[PDB]
Design a protein around this ligand. Structure first.
Ligand SMILES: COc1ccc(N[C@H](NS(N)(=O)=O)Oc2ccccc2)cc1OC
Ligand SMILES: [Zn+2]
Length: 257
């Protein structure tokens, strides 16, 4: 029964999921003056041309766009990664106001929202097996700032009315995730975890330097979603982000000098 409120939010999660106070938790603050250029990083390859989106779902915490991951249709390779990682879904975290919403921060700076593209390591055969491994997942994180509209985000925005409440889903085929990327693929990378319960420490984080711009109108439609189920009292789906966690014994590396 976890959530983001006073009584079931991030400060409570450790009781059901003790790993919340683990050695490799996410998100983290990215101190740009402590992260180091790593020349050993190979180029990052985002290969989404044949992506096959299936559906969108309000899971009571965020909304998920899910993809067909039965083959290597949309994959992330290179960068810090060994092998091939298949896209399984994306989702966002966002705020009640534009001054907050992201999970990662950059020199303590909070963005309005954060996009998570979730991929699993094909050497482990399925997602469930992957989340039992220290290198099972790779998540591509993209910051959102408010300014001009993001054209590739509008189709997402325009389906949200049809999935306002928990448990609601809609057909969401022929959506191209390439329309959510910034120009530049400059990133920071570090080893971490899922930022939601069960907070598994299986993730290679790849966080893009360059934010994308979304319109106020677009983010306002995110804030119209509901945490609650149909016919329940309205709890707006806002501030579904986990704050920064201790870096502990970890190095954040930059792919750019
Ligand atoms: C196919 O199964 C999964 C797919 C994806 C994630 N990741 C993800 N959160 S995050 N920030 O760690 O990536 O899950 C949630 C959860 C609630 C709201 C929003 C995103 C977790 C999954 O099973 C645990
Ligand atoms: Zn996430």
């Amino acid at each position: 029964h976890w959530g983001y409120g006073k009584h079931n939010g991030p400060e409570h999660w450790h009781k059901d999921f003790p790993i919340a106070k683990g050695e490799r938790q996410s998100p983290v603050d990215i101190d740009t003056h402590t992260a180091k250029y790593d020349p050993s990083l190979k180029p990052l390859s985002v290969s989404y041309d044949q992506a096959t989106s299936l559906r969108i779902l309000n899971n009571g915490h965020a909304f998920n766009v899910e993809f067909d991951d039965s083959q290597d249709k949309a994959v992330l390779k290179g960068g810090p990664l060994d092998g091939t990682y298949r896209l399984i879904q994306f989702h966002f975290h966002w705020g009640s106001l534009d001054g907050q919403g992201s999970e990662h921060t950059v020199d303590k700076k909070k963005y309005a929202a954060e996009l998570h593209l979730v991929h699993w390591n094909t050497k482990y055969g399925d997602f469930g097996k992957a989340v039992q491994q220290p290198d099972g997942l790779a998540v591509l994180g993209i910051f959102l700032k408010v300014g001009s509209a993001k054209p590739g985000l509008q189709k997402v925005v325009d389906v949200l009315d049809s999935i306002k409440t928990k448990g609601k889903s809609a057909d969401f085929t022929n959506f191209d995730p390439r329309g959510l990327l910034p120009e530049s693929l400059d990133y920071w990378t570090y080893p971490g975890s899922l930022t939601t319960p069960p907070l598994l420490e299986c993730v290679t984080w790849i966080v893009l330097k360059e934010p994308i711009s979304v319109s106020s109108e677009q983010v306002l439609k995110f804030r119209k979603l509901n945490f609650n189920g149909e016919g329940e009292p309205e709890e707006l789906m806002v501030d579904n982000w986990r704050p920064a966690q201790p870096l502990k014994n970890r190095q954040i590396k930059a792919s750019f000098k």
